[PDB]
Symmetry: C3
Subunit: 389 residues, 3 copies
């Protein structure tokens, strides 16, 4: 709420909520790390939707606390002091909080303080699934994780493996680039195309009407909200790039057909199937860290019926898929996102851009996101609720 | 237009336009590089008056395009793709533009797009003269280059050689320092003074009336607009610096008389004649890159009637004039400009400064610039014209 | 005056002046360096309360001038030119000022200028005491230095030795941390505690009423204004830190009793006695450099009746006290101050903090500072008085 000039928001009637969501959507689940990255009793710090958070594993279970002492507002993480398995003590004046509910249960510097038991640090639900750590950055009872994940991510036999890193661009530029039908042009020279014998057009010549370009999903049984890119159902793929009629570039004529099923879902996760191989799928999140950065959380899934298959997949992922696809293919997406930063930095790119046909997919997403998000994160949420107002 | 607090502009009645021109004057020709720095088919990027530009040489002729794709606003230069001699293709979605007129002539990702032939990237006139590349950062048909150059710069026999670099100061601080009669004090220890046996006073004791201190030229046949520094016509040069009557510093008593003809011209180019030698002239521009930086475009001219003379001059320029004068003399001007940055950074130096007599020259320039500039560059010009307003 | 959002100042009714004093209090004496750091004829530059200053020693006496030429606002210090013992000449156009009164007495570039003798650079009183250089950053005749120093700092036999450095935090965060009764918890592992066999509790269990927690001194004969921390008179020290009743940390049970007398005084100097040893005292200033930094001026005092005692103290200070206490003990105070920067950066920490009992000392200081400061430094003071208004 109110993150962008009200004059700008008025000019984007329809996508106002999305354009105002510079810090991301509150009240959604977001992956922030892999389960294997956090061990028992070893607290980790991270920033999500602009909020500094602390995560710890106690008796195998994950807990999340706001990394900001209620007293003088310092980050508890400057010098972590976990003196009992169930608590964390601020290094400054020893205000001690329970990981389970955030309650201020003791103050070592004054065990008679009237504040004891009468204050509580903000906590957020945390859930592990498919080896991924999800945090519900929101208030009140959380919805099922399934609502904020793409279809078949949570399938029992679906084996998930991935990589995560911090990228310097607003999360929305990442989402749009990912769901951009014509951006495929930047991947024309990817080592994955050659090395994995992929069929890859340079673009698409749209066919049919506007509504036919996508499929807005707002009737999913588990509550998922997203959009499918159907530009290929009535459109013809472009394999010959011409300038003045002269062919100056050709697409890839490989045998492997992939990415014929592309969808984007709130809070901002893309599903590409099948990819990077006809028997795999890719699920990637663009998680808001702050207005200028996001976690590029990549995962590749492949059905596995037994430990043997999971073991081999893990080996192929490490030796091939990770370096050839997640990096060899998606690395170009990273600098593409970065290249849009300047134009959208002053919030004016949203009104000065000149879109064309294939962008219908992006427009569909901006509308769905505007209408189905569960809340707009604001600086007020970040700085906290005032006292004495 | 509107680059400075309106309260400030009101307090500088008269020089308001000049004080507001933080980004420079639009609709003027500006040198940005030397001809030898750009070869056939090798695009170059640069920022002029805050605008990112692309320049290319095609069939020997120079062309200039706005380095910002109309689609998503990325710089085409992130990954240059010139697929035909007459065009450039954006690396993102392949929108293709003609260098000649900026028209969007093709889109490789969708050759059926309705945008083709219906959009046009901004272009700017470019002209080469005396081995220097000039760009007309303005709209509509450009005036003769002569209007924006000092007298005798374009003389047929005038051989021009120079150096260019980026300096961290607003362009106006550079102009004023260059046209500052008393700033000569900072050059008192220049190696050029000794090594070239120059006569150089520490300052001047003004004589005559105010109007006699300068000569405002606004009746030049080719349209040039500038001011001559005539402080030496009625004033007496100061060769003995005294404090409490005691001589603490003396000027230079060399035989070579130079810089007795000094003039500043819009858009911001200084002419010093003769200098650094009695048979040479210096023409230097202070080109606006953005509000905090400028190109310090230095050139030294010397009449040459034949290839033999031009060849020797080139040799002397490289072995002597460039290192002894352009660098040995003008290097002090660079940190002097930088030293004024802080005081003028908040736009208040324009009203808090305390000028004295010799500054009449600077005041004359601020008035001429305010009255004869061809337009004030604004952030609106930089960010571009909005859509849907 | 007006350094903070008026909405914020209204919410802190009472401490408004203190909260608005981001740049420090004008019209107070502040130490900025040690006498031994500035020699005869060797000018030094520094920034105090946001103002760039120049200090010089002439015939053994210190003088302070504003490091900003009246002409074009450059710092004279870019290239110091002291051509006569009593003056300094700006490197740009040679406007020459007297160190004694700041008067513009000559201009080498124009000895006939009408400005000569009619302009004056700002000067500030400077006084040396106990080997420390104090500057009265204020206007008009200065009060006795004693008014702005803690009791017994100026005692004849009191031998003062110290260290100074620049710290990245607003000065107020430094003052509050220093006068914070419960912050002692951060010093629990200091090498000084063990190596000097100190008795050091983890905190305090307050006793008595609110007014009994401190002693506000506003009736001192020399005008000093400060507050004593009396939390230990009715309170019981905490040596056993418990969580859920379980002892998880203990204080230090050393024999040496110290810091039983703690007081903070305007403009911002703390006195701890006895410390770091039962026969010594510590006086430390948190001097405003700009809104984000301060000088952490530490001094340790010890009575000495003869040169022999002073000589031995100096030796002990260098080999023990300086590295074990000033650094070994106070280094933790440095990062503690830095840890509060973020929460108070937007000026909202003053209203969002949640204090508890021992903070009564800090509240008492914020009230005293608000009521007895001699002026609020503003950006207006820094940028200077306008011309032509
Ligand atoms: S800031 Fe955490 S206990 Fe004081
Ligand atoms: S941003 Fe250039 S073609 Fe899309
Ligand atoms: S700026 Fe100092 S004499 Fe001109
Ligand atoms: Fe991509
Ligand atoms: Fe110069
Ligand atoms: Fe401390």
């Amino acid at each position: 709420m109110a993150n962008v000039d009200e004059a700008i928001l008025k000019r984007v009637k329809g996508w106002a909520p999305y354009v105002d969501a510079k810090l991301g959507f509150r009240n959604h689940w977001y992956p922030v790390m892999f389960s294997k990255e956090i061990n028992e009793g070893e607290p980790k710090t991270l920033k999500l939707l602009g909020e500094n958070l602390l995560v710890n594993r106690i008796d195998g279970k994950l807990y999340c606390l706001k990394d900001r002492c209620l007293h003088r507002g310092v980050q508890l993480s400057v010098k972590v002091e976990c003196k009992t398995k169930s608590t964390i003590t601020c290094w400054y004046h020893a205000w001690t909080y329970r990981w389970e509910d955030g309650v201020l249960c003791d103050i070592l510097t004054n065990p008679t303080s009237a504040q004891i038991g009468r204050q509580k640090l903000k906590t957020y639900p945390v859930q592990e699934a498919k080896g991924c750590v999800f945090i519900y950055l929101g208030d009140g009872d959380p919805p099922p994780l399934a609502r904020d994940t793409p279809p078949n991510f949570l399938d029992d036999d679906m084996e998930i493996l991935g990589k995560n890193q911090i990228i310097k661009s607003n999360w929305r530029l990442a989402v749009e680039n990912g769901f951009d039908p014509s951006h495929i042009y930047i991947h024309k020279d990817s080592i994955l195309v050659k090395d994995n014998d992929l069929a890859l057009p340079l673009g698409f010549a749209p066919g049919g009407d506007r509504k036919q370009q996508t499929r807005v999903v707002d009737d999913d049984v588990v509550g998922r909200k997203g959009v499918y890119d159907l530009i290929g159902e009535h459109g013809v793929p472009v394999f010959e790039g011409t300038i003045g009629g002269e062919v100056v570039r050709e697409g890839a004529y490989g045998e492997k057909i992939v990415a014929n099923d592309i969808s984007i879902w709130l809070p901002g996760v893309l599903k590409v199937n099948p990819f990077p191989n006809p028997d795999m799928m890719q699920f990637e999140w663009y998680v808001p860290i702050d207005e200028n950065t996001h976690y590029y959380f990549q995962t590749l899934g492949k059905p596995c019926a037994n430990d043997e298959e999971r073991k081999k997949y893990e080996q192929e992922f490490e030796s091939k898929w990770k370096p050839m696809a997640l990096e060899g293919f998606n690395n170009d997406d990273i600098w593409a996102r970065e290249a849009m930063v300047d134009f959208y930095a002053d919030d004016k790119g949203w009104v000065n851009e000149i879109l064309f046909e294939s962008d219908e997919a992006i427009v569909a997403w901006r509308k769905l996101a505007s209408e189905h998000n569960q809340g707009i994160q604001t600086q007020a949420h970040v700085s906290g609720l005032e006292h004495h107002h």
